[PDB]
Amino acid sequence: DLKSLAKRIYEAYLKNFNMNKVKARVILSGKASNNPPFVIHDMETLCMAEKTLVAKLVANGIQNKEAEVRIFHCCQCTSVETVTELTEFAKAIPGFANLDLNDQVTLLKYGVYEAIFAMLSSVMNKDGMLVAYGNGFITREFLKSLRKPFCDIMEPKFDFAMKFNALELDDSDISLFVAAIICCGDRPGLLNVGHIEKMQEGIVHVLRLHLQSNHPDDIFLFPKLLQKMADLRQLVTEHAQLVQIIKKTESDAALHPLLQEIYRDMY
């Protein structure tokens, strides 16, 4: 069971996420490439990127909507796809599918954004992040140049990602970290807390062992990761607050049904 639990979770991760750290790092390496990612660094390049990567946003009057609204829409589409992948990944985590459906819903509801921000680190560097399935790269400075409140969304995530990337984790490490995030026994409204705590204990057990053999020169890596879990929960609570503000003040930023479900009565 535990001897190869890490390998299985890792397989589920490689099978369910179209983008991971090894793939992202190759694209960001700057090495010779036949299809380098299109850089979005200003309004001009944003329109060019939309024309090729999401053509629908350059026609039908949509090109007349604020850049911020178009970017926010793309952010939503991206989150919906990631939530969809995380749901399939969760179903592949040993024991998750055995939980009562309500508990499965609750774990994903509170855990998906912690996992999303942790995984964002994989496609980010200090200057920006990969988007559109690795075909685009939007700069950190461009996002900062947007008008509030849209320019206030990404900075905290970039800051988190820089400190997270400093841990030099690889996909095998990340797959276990994400599983631990999802199988969290203290989420509000859980029914079988005991059952979930048992799953988490096993995952944390294999994670601790994995870090010991995969990262021998950093004896504090495990506690560092525990702190990251706490940092992520805070990052999500603050993000939800901003999302609620955008919902109440932005006329063309209505949330996609799935995202609305997730944030409804979250924090």
Binding site: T84, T87, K91, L101, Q104, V105, L108, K109, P257, L258, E261, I262, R264
Partner: peptide
């Protein structure tokens, strides 16, 4: 219903 989409995704 509450969480209609998540419930659906989980049951497939």
């Amino acid at each position: 219903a509450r969480h209609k989409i998540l419930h659906r995704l989980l049951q497939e």
